[PDB]
Amino acid sequence: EIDNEGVIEADTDAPQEMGDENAEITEAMMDEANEKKGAAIDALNDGELQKAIDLFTDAIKLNPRLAILYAKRASVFVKLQKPNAAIRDCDRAIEINPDSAQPYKWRGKAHRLLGHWEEAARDLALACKLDYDEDASAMLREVQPRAQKIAEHRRKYERKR
Template structure:
């Protein structure tokens, strides 16, 4: 008999010994029938008390504003900051900027981008040019491109009101309301205008709703955790007497083809460690219940987990694991990390199915 098949059978038996409740899974009905046919005893299916019957299902959070998907265009051309700027270059860049503004007035946005890109290549140390192009990208509803330009403008001039305004507007397009409110407040302090006020008002309203939502479900999760601890105390003595019982969190990652939610830093570390021991690539997906794009990505992520059963697909709520998100510098959702041999090897904020699948293939040696 094929040794690989024998090893798989041994692993299945080990899992069932560790967690007999698995025998009641419909996919293992044939195995349960086989055991019973041999006269084996299969423990009764655990009652509701042994399961997470009080799973917290968060309601959708109603927020103001239309949500767009992140743009997947290749990064726009950036200027070389080491270029020496002559008066001729500066004048030519200013002329191109004027042409770009005229194109914007005529709603020729692609043409405006071309003019501004040419101007940036001539005068790459101008925060004004980057902020101007960011604003056009906002008009084109290309939030990711706008943020890249606004970031560059703010690196050149940390007091660029236009940079903060463009980035804040881009964050609002992508439903990153807290980041949007932060940038728009700074823009308003530096150079107040009615447009900033209008968008900031909407962003702050959404931030208040998000914070109220977090507080509510944080309280519910704490109550649930207290019940879980109390429940575990009742079974601790029985568990300690059974040498076959293994850590269910570590075993959970061995169930191929599933998305595994993590609810604590300890739980996440155990699963990452188990994946490392198995030499599995891990995809760690930070999401949020209030995130519109995440609702679209959810089914996609599940289908990828089914398609790549030897990759560990973990999911974490940015509000629930805020400390981990902060440590990993997660500034928005959806954010994806790829972990290999216990180390972060890739990261992307907002991505299409094709982009995420390509990343997975690259790090699993399938490209």
């Protein structure tokens, strides 16, 4: 008996626009993506989450090798209850800088939204050791016994199987 509270329906959209991972990023471009970054936060404080996503995407296309632009867009994406698109962003952030804690914080929420108990118990616990937050901790403590219970069930099964 597993408590599926807070668990929603997986987003079934086309991949959001990523960058050109292998593109030349110039001084101008680098400036031009920074101003967009600032504006996309201005929208995020103010609550216009979709204007944030467009302004993060507009930055990502000019500076596709900046891990924060992917950590922060997936910050928004979780709010719009879009975990796969979050995960998509997060996976791109780590692949750049795995030393950054945010990509594991959000990707762990994304997994929590989808009901991936274990997947979530890792990433959160990992972000808690990379850069502790009370928001990550509280989430982890919530997921823990779920992810435990599921993993304990997974054994007893795969053992017979």
